[PDB]
Amino acid sequence: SMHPGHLKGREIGMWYAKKQ
């Protein structure tokens, strides 16, 4: 599936949190 590549930048901060 589509991986978090766009958020890889700063948005990545939400990645870990796994929030909306």
Swiss-Prot record:
Outcome (variant: Y16A): Does not inhibit G4-DNA-binding
Outcome when changing G13A: Reduces G4-RNA-binding
Tissue and organ expression note: Highly expressed in testis.
Intrachain S-S bonds: none
Effect of W15A: Does not inhibit G4-DNA-binding
Region DSM (DHX36-specific motif), annotated ranges: 3-20
Subcellular location: Nucleus; Cytoplasm; Cytoplasm, Cytosol; Cytoplasm, Stress granule
Effect of G13P: Greatly reduces G4-RNA-binding
Outcome of substituting G13L: Inhibits G4-DNA-binding
Superkingdom in the source lineage: Eukaryota
Domain comment in the entry: The DHX36-specific motif (DSM) form folds into a DNA-binding-induced alpha-helix that together with the oligonucleotide and oligosaccharide-binding-fold-like (OB-fold-like) subdomain, selectively bind to Myc-promoter G4-DNA-containing structure in an ATP-dependent manner. Upon G4-DNA-binding, DHX36 pulls on DSM in the 3'-direction, inducing rearrangement of the RecA-like 1 and 2 and the degenerate-winged-helix (WH) regions; these rearrangements are propbably responsible for the ATP-independent repetitive G4-DNA unfolding activity, one residue at a time.
Protein function: Multifunctional ATP-dependent helicase that unwinds G-quadruplex (G4) structures. Plays a role in many biological processes such as genomic integrity, gene expression regulations and as a sensor to initiate antiviral responses. G4 structures correspond to helical structures containing guanine tetrads. Binds with high affinity to and unwinds G4 structures that are formed in nucleic acids (G4-DNA and G4-RNA). Plays a role in genomic integrity.
Subunit structure comment from the entry: Found in a multi-helicase-TICAM1 complex at least composed of DHX36, DDX1, DDX21 and TICAM1; this complex exists in resting cells with or without dsRNA poly(I:C) ligand stimulation. Interacts (via C-terminus) with TICAM1 (via TIR domain). Interacts (via C-terminus) with DDX21; this interaction serves as bridges to TICAM1. Interacts with TERT; this interaction is dependent on the ability of DHX36 to bind to the G-quadruplex RNA (G4-RNA) structure present in the telomerase RNA template component (TERC).
Protein family membership: Belongs to the DEAD box helicase family. DEAH subfamily.
Listed name of the protein: ATP-dependent DNA/RNA helicase DHX36
Species this protein is from: Homo sapiens (Human)
Biological classification of the source: Eukaryota, Metazoa, Chordata, Craniata, Vertebrata
Recorded name of the encoding gene: DHX36
Part of the whole protein covered: 53 to 70 of 1008
